[PDB]
Ligand binder design. Structure first.
Ligand SMILES: CC(C)CCC[C@@H](C)[C@H]1CC[C@H]2[C@@H]3CC=C4C[C@@H](O)CC[C@]4(C)[C@H]3CC[C@]12C
Ligand SMILES: CC(C)CCC[C@@H](C)[C@H]1CC[C@H]2[C@@H]3CC=C4C[C@@H](O)CC[C@]4(C)[C@H]3CC[C@]12C
Ligand SMILES: CC(C)CCC[C@@H](C)[C@H]1CC[C@H]2[C@@H]3CC=C4C[C@@H](O)CC[C@]4(C)[C@H]3CC[C@]12C
Ligand SMILES: CC(C)CCC[C@@H](C)[C@H]1CC[C@H]2[C@@H]3CC=C4C[C@@H](O)CC[C@]4(C)[C@H]3CC[C@]12C
Ligand SMILES: CC(C)CCC[C@@H](C)[C@H]1CC[C@H]2[C@@H]3CC=C4C[C@@H](O)CC[C@]4(C)[C@H]3CC[C@]12C
Ligand SMILES: CC(C)CCC[C@@H](C)[C@H]1CC[C@H]2[C@@H]3CC=C4C[C@@H](O)CC[C@]4(C)[C@H]3CC[C@]12C
Ligand SMILES: CC(C)CCC[C@@H](C)[C@H]1CC[C@H]2[C@@H]3CC=C4C[C@@H](O)CC[C@]4(C)[C@H]3CC[C@]12C
Ligand SMILES: CC(C)CCC[C@@H](C)[C@H]1CC[C@H]2[C@@H]3CC=C4C[C@@H](O)CC[C@]4(C)[C@H]3CC[C@]12C
Ligand SMILES: CCCCCCCC/C=C\CCCCCCCC(=O)O
Ligand SMILES: CCCCCCCC/C=C\CCCCCCCC(=O)O
Ligand code: NA
Ligand SMILES: [Zn+2]
Ligand SMILES: [Zn+2]
Lengths: 641, 641
């Protein structure tokens, strides 16, 4: 029967009568037309569903109305309105105008007839345009997909899908232009790239991956919300979606950002060179060695698991096309070669460059001291605090190792990797507190085993607390007992000294209270703030004790105190901007994704990598230079606190 | 049109003519009938395919002939014969006999008519019986599935599928009894458990998982062999398959095997008790302490990555139903609780029980030595070899830590976990060689860091060689250089002594040559044989040097030598029986799965865990007791080699 587009057809189908409709249309060359078939049935009997068959030249598509979904825990869902887009045939210029015919056959085996309504329409907005936002709606029984053709200049695009509400949750899949299109929840993840989506989704594609420089963006709504961190839930679950296809940054942005990263850090090298030059002009005109290596060994022992894991996770993402596995920022994930997010790795360059600079600065001090000790300078031998540079070498190397470990985490950030980003800073903050204590008490043995053992136990507490003590009121109660007791014990060792000890313990008790009351899910970041607080508290205690003892703070140490405080306040702010959350579902993390802040390449977490290295670098300089005033004062006179 | 079952229908379909067939059958209660629809079209034009629609009461099924598959690297496959089993409806006794009607509609849009052949048949062997082998055939375009109902007495079954040839490779999926059945490669992995299969597959199921105590066993043949370690490849890819449903072992087998494992090892405790009792009757009638703890720290540092990984892999297996992720011996993987293969973890009880026994043996001699020294015994003080039991405590605790590390690996053995099965044995073999050298050269410092560092570097070489040096002629050439040079340097320090050194280098050179020519993919096991070989060579050198120096081998040490040699020969044999291979694909590894050898619970790899612990336990006793004859001899008179 000849039928018209955009015309709603009603009918009753029983065993005897089947209703057939014929739609003929012409597709002009270089023009793609998609036909959407909508059938709905208001029939109580699901024992006798309305069966819809759409036959085209090269394909037959069949479905049933009401569409039934099997839910978790034996939940049943039925969708009375079912809509499908028929795979489009694109006429090349050579083929010419193509006359195509669609047959929509409607049948039912019901003894009394079952009613249905049919609307077949042509999609006027099937093709998606660049930098244009398109708003649409999808349902579990009404999946939608659209066509995008890569423009010549554009060699890569990002697919940004936004929703106002978290649920129902969807799947955004990118597939090549070949029939069939997998737009059902039972085959959508078979082919191509896909992401789970509650509120936001971002898929980055390259032209070389797709033949014909075109793809289909498929939007499938799940009958239930379980895979996307939701409780559950026969009635329309319409999701209002907006999708925009934006070109990615050009290769020039990669060059400008890599140069910027190296240059800000190399600027520090120039600044150290200028200071060194002034001393050279003045000169002409006028806790051990197994520690540098130990930090390496500990880092390598710790790097091996993550690196082996990276391979396997990277493998599974590439094959399955599951962008769910790695918790990238997505909105600012910039790919170089294999790396999905090169920008994250590049941000860790400062840790390596700044850590290296520190080793060179420490070395000059060691070489100069050693030369002075040989010359038997009175000041080198008997004036000032005895100088040991071993912990300083470990600190510099640890900063570099932190950069490498953080970069490894960023190859695939996820639940198995969560610790590695900020963990080595527990070692960095731990080493810095020994250097403070060793300054006055240079008699502390400090075995290599003790560092390795402490790190292992601290990480053991960290990983165990995240996995098994996620939010339990029990775990946080026990941990608060250790935290407070550790603070009491430490305070008595490292420490008006009494008033300072009270302030010192109180800050730790306050932190324990915040943790107990708030129960943060990110125990790794909470554990990190425990080491940062105690590092800054002991550093502040040292400065206060230095002032009460009338010891001076020279301009070079004093500037580093201001820079350390300013950089720590700035770095912590960018640390508190959560752009992805491995504790939640992949769809929940993606709601936190943001467009990146600096040079269109670096996000808030990238700035935290720049500023954490600079804050840690300037913290090293405070320890290195603070007691340089005493170099004139006799060691005998020098007090001990 | 009324049509007959098991009758082949021919017809020509053009735009004008569609051919419709009606098949009616009666399903008796408590009787399941499945109908298979076969359509084959020998039509050159794939632009105009034959479209087949099979409509039933509940659902409608449609497909096209020839069936087209999109292959990797743009390969195209077409199958003129397509066959499908229609979702059976099971009549309960209450419903009674049910008269069901099937409509098979055949259509084509070809201008000249396209021929087809149709056979609709009822499957007389749809239901699978217990302990009965059923042989069938499946094709990429002709998937098959069958029904199994759990017997009342049987609470769990294993699905064993066997094929004579590796390719074409298949997917065996287990799904609940609900329509639709996902029997296509684009939806087979959506629901239920599934395994990839080349030659063998084994799926273990429990009755509690399935409602109705029934499931579908779905067999889907892949159009290509890539996922199963093979290459490409329009023509039938028929796979002859045999599937048997066998009940799993009863809970009594779990109890009898757990008791056996504890008892053989506790028997050793009784044997040590009997020896201790005889000495107590005789008595009445007449390289340091930071090492025990260090091995713990190293093991914990090493246990943390694997344990965190276990959680995430175990998660993904449970959700997706993908049995391909872990590399168990599925033919004897027995589950207890959350563990998929409990027998693999129980087999590691020998390490902890025999490692604990050795610590009690060392402790006695440590206590009796200190008690003597307190009593100023002449023989304890000036006769015999200086006694340092510190490395014995490390060896005993390392054996325990190897049992827990090997048990953690067997929670989910895979490519990310490879090292954990045998890596700590490198530590054990290395500790045992230091104890040998420390015996006649008591003045060796042996720092804790050195053990940790050596382990880290040795594992770094092991993991790097497996991942990046899989079979390269380059990597094995460099490694043979280190292996020859390391053994050449070691031979000079520890080793007619000259003839022995020559024999000692030839064995290492031979091992290197075997590796160089053979290029084993399992570098972890090859690395293990390097440590075992040198441990037994240095042990044999010590015995030979003991005999040439006219020093006796007492009966207790001498028995341990025989037991160590016999157990090492026996353990190595069960080590060479590869029942699973993480280096290959999951389907390739399943080809080596075997039914398990001992008590219907333990396979060849489980026996290697029993015998490796016993060989390592008796190796410890050789070191502990060998020089107990020198206790009467004065320390000065004792030679050093
Ligand atoms: C690994 C990171 C967290 C740094 C850890 C530093 C701390 C926790 C480690 C490193 C050095 C260690 C100390 C080394 C020296 C001594 C003095 C000794 O008589 C008692 C142990 C004690 C007090 C150790 C306590 C723990 C210790 C302070
Ligand atoms: C905060 C972390 C990272 C670093 C803390 C350094 C701590 C662990 C170190 C530095 C100084 C050390 C103390 C130095 C002096 C003494 C006195 C001695 O009779 C007992 C050990 C004791 C009490 C040490 C315990 C460990 C100690 C307190
Ligand atoms: C988790 C937070 C709140 C507390 C962390 C406590 C950690 C840093 C403390 C508690 C127990 C400590 C260990 C106690 C025992 C030893 C042996 C000794 O040779 C010093 C190192 C070592 C290994 C200590 C390292 C530091 C240590 C692990
Ligand atoms: C704020 C937290 C992380 C600091 C934890 C470090 C402090 C409290 C821990 C770490 C290592 C611990 C020390 C480990 C070993 C010794 C030597 C022993 O003879 C006295 C106790 C003493 C000195 C412990 C005191 C508490 C201790 C110093
Ligand atoms: C895993 C295996 C190789 C462990 C073997 C450990 C023992 C047997 C080996 C490994 C390192 C070796 C030592 C390496 C360096 C020296 C310093 C030299 O001036 C005397 C010999 C001595 C002390 C060697 C003795 C033998 C030695 C201790
Ligand atoms: C089987 C082959 C690959 C093993 C080779 C191991 C070699 C390369 C590694 C493993 C253990 C390592 C040693 C561990 C202990 C020490 C003592 C330390 O004070 C200096 C480094 C030194 C000397 C290391 C040198 C390199 C080393 C000998
Ligand atoms: C752990 C597995 C992989 C192998 C273990 C090897 C251990 C036991 C061996 C291998 C390398 C050896 C060290 C190599 C370096 C030296 C030289 C000298 O300065 C003291 C002995 C010492 C420190 C050796 C001690 C024993 C040692 C650490
Ligand atoms: C694999 C078989 C052959 C055993 C391997 C023995 C290795 C681990 C042993 C044997 C010879 C040893 C080396 C001999 C020479 C030295 C002394 C000093 O310069 C540092 C340790 C170092 C470098 C040793 C490291 C460990 C060593 C390389
Ligand atoms: C004197 C104060 C020193 C600095 C204290 C810092 C306090 C940090 C405490 C933990 C907060 C963790 C919860 C929210 C942060 C999440 C980290 C992230 O977004 O990646
Ligand atoms: C004197 C000889 C001492 C013992 C030497 C043992 C030799 C072992 C060498 C490596 C063989 C590795 C290749 C095949 C074994 C695979 C291990 C496995 O099946 O799990
Ligand atoms: Na099913
Ligand atoms: Zn980071
Ligand atoms: Zn094992």
């Amino acid at each position: 029967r000849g039928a018209d587009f955009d015309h709603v057809y009603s009918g009753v189908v029983n065993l005897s009568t089947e209703n057939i409709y014929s739609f003929n249309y012409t597709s002009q060359p270089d023009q793609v037309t998609a036909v959407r078939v909508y059938v709905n049935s208001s029939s109580e009997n699901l024992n006798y569903p309305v069966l819809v068959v759409v036959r085209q030249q090269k394909e037959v598509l069949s479905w049933q109305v009401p569409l039934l979904f099997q839910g978790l825990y034996q939940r049943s869902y039925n969708y009375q309105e079912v809509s499908r887009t028929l795979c489009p045939s694109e006429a090349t210029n050579e083929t010419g105008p193509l006359q195509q015919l669609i047959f929509v056959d409607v049948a039912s085996m019901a003894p009394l007839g079952a009613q249905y309504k049919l609307l077949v329409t042509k999609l006027k907005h099937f093709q998606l345009r660049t930098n244009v936002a398109f708003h649409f709606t999808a349902s579990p029984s009404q999946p939608q997909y659209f066509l995008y053709k890569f423009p010549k200049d554009v060699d890569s695009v990002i697919i940004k899908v936004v929703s106002e509400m978290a649920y129902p949750c969807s799947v955004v899949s990118v597939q090549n232009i070949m029939c069939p299109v997998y737009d059902l929840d039972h085959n959508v993840e078979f082919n191509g790239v896909y992401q789970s989506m509650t509120k936001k989704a971002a898929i980055t594609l390259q032209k070389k991956d797709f033949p014909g420089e075109q793809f289909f963006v498929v939007f499938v709504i799940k009958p239930e919300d379980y895979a996307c961190g939701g409780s559950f839930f026969n009635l329309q679950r319409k999701k209002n979606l907006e999708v925009t296809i934006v070109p990615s940054i050009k290769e020039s942005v990669y060059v400008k950002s890599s140069l910027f990263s190296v240059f800000i850090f190399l600027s520090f090298y120039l600044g150290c060179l200028l200071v060194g030059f002034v001393h050279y002009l003045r000169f002409q005109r006028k806790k051990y060695k197994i520690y540098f290596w130990n930090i390496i060994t500990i880092a390598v022992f710790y790097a091996l698991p993550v690196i082996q894991l990276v391979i396997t996770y990277q493998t599974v993402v590439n094959v399955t096309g599951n962008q769910d596995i790695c918790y990238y920022n997505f909105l600012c994930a910039h790919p170089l070669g294999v790396l999905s997010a090169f920008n994250n790795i590049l941000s860790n360059l400062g840790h390596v460059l700044l850590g290296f600079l520190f080793l060179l600065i420490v070395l000059r001090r060691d070489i100069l001291h050693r030369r002075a000790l040989e010359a038997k300078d009175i000041f080198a031998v008997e004036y000032g605090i005895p100088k040991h540079f071993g912990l300083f070498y470990a600190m510099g190397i640890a900063l570099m190792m932190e950069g490498v470990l953080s970069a490894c985490y960023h190859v695939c950030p996820n639940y198995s990797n969560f610790q590695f980003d900020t963990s080595f800073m527990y070692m960095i903050a731990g080493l810095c507190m020994l250097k403070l204590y060793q300054t006055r008490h240079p008699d502390i043995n400090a075995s290599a085993y003790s560092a390795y053992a402490s790190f292992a136990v601290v990480i053991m507490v960290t990983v165990l607390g995240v996995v098994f003590g996620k939010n339990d009121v029990w775990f946080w109660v026990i941990f608060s007992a250790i935290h407070v007791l550790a603070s009491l014990a430490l305070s008595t060792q490292i420490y008006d000294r009494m008033v300072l000890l009270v302030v010192g313990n109180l800050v730790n008790w306050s932190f324990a209270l915040f943790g107990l009351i708030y129960r943060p899910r990110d125990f790794a970041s909470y554990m990190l703030g425990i080491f940062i607080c105690n590092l800054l508290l002991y550093l502040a205690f040292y400065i206060i004790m230095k002032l009460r003892s009338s010891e001076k703070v020279l301009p070079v140490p004093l500037f580093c105190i201001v820079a350390t405080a300013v950089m720590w306040a700035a770095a912590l702010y960018f640390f508190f901007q959560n752009l992805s959350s491995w504790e939640g579902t992949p769809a929940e993390s993606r709601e936190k994704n943001r467009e990146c802040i600096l040079l269109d390449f670096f996000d808030d977490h990238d700035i935290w990598h720049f500023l954490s290295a600079t804050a840690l670098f300037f913290s090293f300089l405070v320890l290195l230079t603070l007691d340089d005033d005493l170099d004139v004062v006799r060691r005998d006179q020098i007090p001990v606190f």
